[model samples]
Target chain A: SSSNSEKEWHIVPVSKDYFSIPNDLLWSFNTTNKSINVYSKCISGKAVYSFNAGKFMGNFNVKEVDGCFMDAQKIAIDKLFSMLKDGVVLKGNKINDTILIEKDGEVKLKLIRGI
Target chain B: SETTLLEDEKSLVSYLNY
Candidate 1:
């Protein structure tokens, strides 16, 4: 059986003329904390990319610079794309212990571990 | 209050993918 806790998942979104290999899903959010740890990296490219992070928020506003929204909005993706060593950290609302990754209305990955 | 994360913007791009 698969428990809804203590598990790991991975997901790599697609791109045009660009290959991305983001860091694996890693986190340590317990009853008193809700933080997400992930490393983002792009193999090679020169352009923009829309990335978002949140639970149940879905792809409602992936293009918006809201909670967990990254883009040329601040820095060029091509510039920060291949930065797998030092990735970003997102602190959720801490309502639940679940994180998700989706694309075009499709649930790509889910980290139901210790989130 | 939201939990502030690390003091690095390395992973400024969203939570997971972009």
Candidate 2:
């Protein structure tokens, strides 16, 4: 259970725009619960994106310190980004959009704008 | 879907190490 298998999934693609960029956001994975060895639970979207992997799992718009500012969950999300490498560097603005990723960390591949 | 939100109060191993 502690191993990285279809049973356990890591989270990425926070809120929609990985950076200030906007696009048709969809969080996907190369592997699902397709592993015969990791079929303890169903692999449906119902179970796949179970928790707040992001604001509505690529559907809802997430603005930091928006409605989430006061929530502790928001605090954790902010902290996570802050702890990432040198932090996210946005090449695009909230209009042009941009993708910022952590150089050395999980979920480092953030699909920024123009992607 | 949102009904399945995990308990933030309880720590997941990922956060514990984080």
Candidate 3:
């Protein structure tokens, strides 16, 4: 389910926390264009999250950054949980079609309480 | 020489286009 190409734009690899994923399954992102694609795996491993179109690699647009910042509001960090259930979202720049994977792993979520 | 350049061009196109 994670390897589907339609989800290409929204899916990214887990390389942030060394305990992220098994090393064999570890891959971040590559570019077809000079612009970068940013992947954010939901605190859960059941899905991979991505956001491209940033001229720079580390950050993204205001809405994108905000949407991402808001999605998984209050789930406990040490469980495979998100506010999202039901589907694997393949999203783009418009602020709607995002991806959230339902995971079976106990990897806790990195919170977004805002800085 | 022409043939080799053609091959090189094809390769470059694929590299940039995809």
Give the best candidate by TM-score.
1
lDDT of 3 by residue, A35-109 (tens): 223334322233323322211112222112323334332112111212112121222222222222222221121
Query: TM-score of each candidate?
Result: 0.24, 0.21, 0.18
Clashing pairs in 2: A21-A97, A21-A98, A99-A112
Candidate 2: tens digits of C-alpha lDDT, residues A1-113: 12232223233344433333211222222122311120112112321212232221211222333332234434434443343323332222242222333323233334333
- Fnat for model 2? 0.00
TM-score of model 3 vs. true structure:
0.18
Which scores greater on TM-score, model 2 or model 3? Answer: 2
lDDT of 1 by residue, A1-115 (tens): 1112122333333233223323332322111122222222322112222233422221111121222223331232222233221222233334233343323443333344223
DockQ, per model, reads 0.10, 0.03, 0.02
Instruction: Indicate the worst ten consecutive residues by lDDT in candidate 1 chain A.
Output: A55-64
Candidate 1 deviant stretches above 4 angstroms: A1-19, A23-31, A39-100, A112-115, B1-18
| Residue B6 miss distance in model 3 (angstroms) | 31
